């Protein structure tokens, strides 16, 4: 029944800053820590993410990890940085510098032991864990590097808990680190087989949505990470709150994974349009389904109609009829039958929660597992190869002891995921 969340890397720490904000919004918990809500449900299932400390203080069940105090400090300095206890800030001193080898292989490795100890302390604080969630970037040093290391140890300690992670996937246009594909390649090599599932977030796609449908001209990462948190929070609240359908994360995982190795997801979100049009929108189930199916409302820079859909999850929040939902999902399946895989009859699955997100009447979360995902892997693998041949920045990595044959195997493994998507693309 409970979940532990660990954030890492500057990305992960800033995403989590919005995530937790939202969760407390959902439950009426004040930036200082106490509960000042107003709904029974708000406290009722609070356990999944909060420990109530003496005084009616709620402690977010999460660990903030970094290798630079300053980022942690900036998190702590805002509202909701006060709700986190000092003991959840685990950090070192001297960066990682966006270096996998430092993060995973060497220096960051050193910190992980202290992180894990706190993890253990929290695992004991829970009655019964459902699972763990981690937030991070695929091409980052602590985000992926150190984060991955941690994941391999947590999974080891808890094989029976859900291990998932959401991660920022290097967008085709904006890479920061020259070896960002290298770090990503290494994380695939480690993560894929050490996780139950991973979500693919593309900032470029997010920037398109924010202007494309939301028509906004000023977003920052906090605004885009709001959208990210909308999908993350969407998933777990249902599990928390009363609904109609089947509201268990593990069951979601079961329904979305047809094969042990292909567990990559494309998140999307509805409704998600500018205020101008809000006066011209109608709120129906087909309306949400139109926004959910549309590739432009995906947060991943993929194109599901290019690939084939293996699995689709449609999560609904708010009062909807069962009939309408059933029929519209069927219609989707029918009309987009050319994209769905024939091996899975009725490949579109649903989940329904009766609690709407604060401020909306209804909402829906799109989760997909298509073959289209392989295109991201292909882009990375290719870029990787070029760098691999030149050893760009690999003296930094090999200087910290990372061996090229390990990287070679990592490359293969990327290619293996692509070939397996092809194996089920048919």
């Amino acid at each position: 029944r409970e979940i532990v969340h660990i954030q890492a890397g500057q990305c992960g720490n800033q995403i989590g800053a919005k995530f937790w904000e939202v969760i407390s919004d959902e439950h009426g918990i004040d930036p200082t820590g106490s509960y000042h809500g107003d709904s029974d449900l708000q406290l009722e299932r609070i356990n999944v993410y909060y420990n109530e400390a003496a005084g009616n203080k709620y402690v977010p069940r999460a660990i903030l990890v970094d290798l630079e105090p300053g980022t942690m400090d900036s998190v702590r300095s805002g509202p909701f940085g006060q709700i986190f206890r000092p003991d959840n800030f685990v950090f070192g001193q001297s960066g990682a510098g966006n270096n996998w080898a430092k993060g995973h292989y060497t220096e960051g490795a050193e910190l992980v032991d202290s992180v894990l100890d706190v993890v253990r302390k929290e695992s004991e604080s829970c009655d019964c864990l459902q699972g763990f969630q981690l937030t991070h970037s695929l091409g980052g040093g602590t985000g992926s590097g150190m984060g991955t290391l941690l994941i391999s140890k947590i999974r080891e300690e808890y094989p029976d808990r859900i291990m998932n992670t959401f991660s920022v996937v290097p967008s085709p246009k904006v890479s920061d680190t020259v070896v960002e594909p290298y770090n990503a390649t290494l994380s695939v090599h480690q993560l894929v087989e050490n996780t139950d599932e991973t979500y693919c977030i593309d900032n470029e796609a997010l920037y398109d949505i924010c202007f494309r449908t939301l028509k906004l001209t000023t977003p920052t990462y906090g605004d885009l990470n709001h959208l990210v948190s909308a999908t993350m929070s969407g998933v777990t609240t249902c599990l928390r709150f009363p609904g109609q359908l089947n509201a268990d994360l593990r069951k979601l995982a079961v329904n979305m994974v047809p094969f042990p190795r292909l567990h990559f997801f494309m998140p999307g979100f509805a409704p998600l349009t500018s205020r101008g049009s809000q006066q011209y929108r109608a709120l129906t189930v087909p309306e949400l389904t139109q926004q959910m199916f549309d590739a432009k409302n995906m947060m991943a820079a993929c194109d599901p109609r290019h690939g084939r859909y293996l699995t689709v999850a449609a999560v609904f929040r708010g009062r909807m009829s069962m009939k309408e939902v059933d029929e519209q999902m069927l219609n989707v399946q029918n009309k987009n039958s050319s994209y769905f895989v024939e091996w899975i009859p009725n490949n579109v699955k649903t989940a329904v929660c009766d609690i709407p997100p604060r401020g909306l009447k209804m909402s829906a979360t799109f989760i997909g597992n298509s073959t289209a995902i392989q295109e991201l892997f292909k882009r990375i693998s290719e870029q990787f190869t070029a760098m691999f041949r030149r050893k760009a920045f690999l003296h930094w990595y090999t200087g910290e002891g990372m061996d090229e044959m390990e990287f070679t195997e990592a490359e293969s493994n990327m290619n293996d995921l692509v070939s397996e998507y092809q194996q089920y693309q048919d």
Binding site: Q10, E68, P69, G70, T71, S74, Q93, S94, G95, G97, N98, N99, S171, K173, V174, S175, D176, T177, V178, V179, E180, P181, N203, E204, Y207, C210, T218, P219, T220, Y221, Q383, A386, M387, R389, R390, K391, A392, F393, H395, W396, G399
Partner: protein, 428 residues
């Protein structure tokens, strides 16, 4: 999270003067150290005085005395101000060996003292010039020791690139060739700028036909602050110095990223003109704002880092990058994908009161490693060769114990370096 600045030689110190002045301007630090308000660079006293963690070395009393008699004399700790009595005479042979080697132990112990004051030494950077006696001679001597004691710390060097047309030091080629030999192998990264190129910037973008070094160093200070003050301040993408090294150095040789900075605009030029992030970055890929006289279009890019100040939205940056990747004529080496480091600080760009540059709301610094650098070495190759073939001025080094073979060797090391650039240019 701390670092040390090292100022060797006039060039190193006078640039440093601008640098520390700017850091004072960044926080409102009074000449006496009183700051009412960046402890990564500074060490705090019970009076609220902060000491810049830096070492000033001059083997001639005069420049340090200039510091000692100026306003910042109260800021600097007397032990930070180290001076000898005699000079290197433009000459590595004395700077690295005969003279500078005598005082260096003191210098190192002051450094070590500061290293002990550091709690989390991230690293350090050394300001000097490629042609001078202490500027390059002594400098490499220091690296020889610092790389032992601080082997795992950042070793970033900043040096003035010898102007191809004007140089006051006849044996500068010889000095620089010797430094190559010894710095390549010890340092992690060396950055450089060309005062001649800067003059062109001053006259074209600032509209100033009278630049002095005190102008020239303000501009340098801008660039340095972007990577020193603002990288410790808050942003979206807070990039560290170690991260810089980890994102700028691709090979174990050195590498030499060159500086480019845009905006460099006079107050009047700022009027009537609206810069965006993208427009500023467009300027960054123009030869016209290249801080070293070396043609960006000649070579191929290997590395590139863009660091942002003030009003920068990643959204705009992303679009800008897309266009520089695809619109420009920027050729790049195969090895590299375009993973250009983007540092994004919210910390606004700052301007020196009474300076030449206009108040800007956003700013971008660019570091780049291009294959055109081999031409710079070619310049040195022939200049060295000419002198060395005639053996002009050779007695000024030989008399201090230098070997002719050594000089040949150093040239050859440069030739090897050029060859490695050749290698990189070959795409693969």
């Amino acid at each position: 999270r701390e670092c040390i600045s090292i100022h060797v030689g006039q060039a190193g110190v006078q640039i440093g003067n601008a640098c520390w002045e700017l850091y004072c301007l960044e926080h409102g630090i009074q000449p006496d150290g009183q700051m009412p308000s960046f402890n990564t660079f500074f060490s705090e006293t019970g009076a609220g005085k902060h000491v810049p963690r830096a070492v000033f070395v001059d083997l001639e009393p005069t420049v340090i005395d200039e510091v000692r008699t100026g306003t910042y004399r109260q800021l600097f700790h007397p032990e930070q101000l180290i001076t000898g009595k005699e000079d290197a005479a433009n000459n590595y042979a004395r700077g690295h060996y005969t003279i500078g080697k005598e005082i260096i132990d003191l210098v190192l112990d002051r450094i070590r003292k500061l290293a002990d004051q550091c709690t989390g030494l991230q690293g350090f950077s050394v300001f000097h010039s490629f042609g001078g006696g202490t500027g390059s001679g002594f400098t490499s001597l220091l690296m020889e020791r610092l790389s032992v004691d601080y082997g795992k710390k950042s070793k970033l060097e900043f040096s003035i690139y010898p102007a191809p047309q004007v140089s006051t030091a006849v044996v500068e080629p010889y000095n620089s060739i010797l430094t190559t030999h010894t710095t390549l192998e010890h340092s992690d990264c060396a950055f450089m700028v060309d005062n001649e190129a800067i003059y062109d910037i001053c006259r074209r973008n600032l509209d100033i036909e009278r630049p002095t070094y005190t102008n020239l160093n303000r501009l340098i200070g801008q660039i340095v602050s972007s990577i020193t003050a603002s990288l410790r301040f808050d942003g979206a993408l807070n990039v560290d110095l170690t991260e810089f090294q980890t994102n700028l150095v691709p090979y174990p040789r050195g590498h030499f990223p060159l500086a480019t900075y845009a905006p460099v605009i006079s107050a009047e030029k700022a009027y009537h003109e609206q810069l965006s992030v993208a427009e500023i970055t467009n300027a960054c890929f123009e030869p016209a704002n290249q801080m070293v006289k070396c043609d960006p279009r000649h070579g191929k890019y290997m590395a590139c880092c863009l660091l942002y100040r003030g009003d920068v939205v990643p959204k705009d940056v992303n679009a800008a990058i897309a266009t520089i990747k695809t619109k420009r004529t920027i050729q790049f080496v195969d090895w590299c994908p375009t993973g250009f480091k983007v540092g994004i600080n919210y910390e606004p760009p700052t301007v020196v009161p009474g300076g030449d540059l206009a108040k800007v709301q956003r700013a971008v610094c660019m570091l780049s490693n291009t294959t055109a650098i081999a031409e710079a070495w070619a310049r040195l190759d022939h200049k060295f060769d000419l002198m060395y073939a005639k053996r002009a001025f050779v007695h000024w080094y030989v008399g201090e114990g230098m070997e002719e073979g050594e000089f040949s060797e150093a040239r050859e090391d440069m030739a090897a370096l050029e060859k490695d650039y050749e290698e990189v240019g070959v795409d693969s």
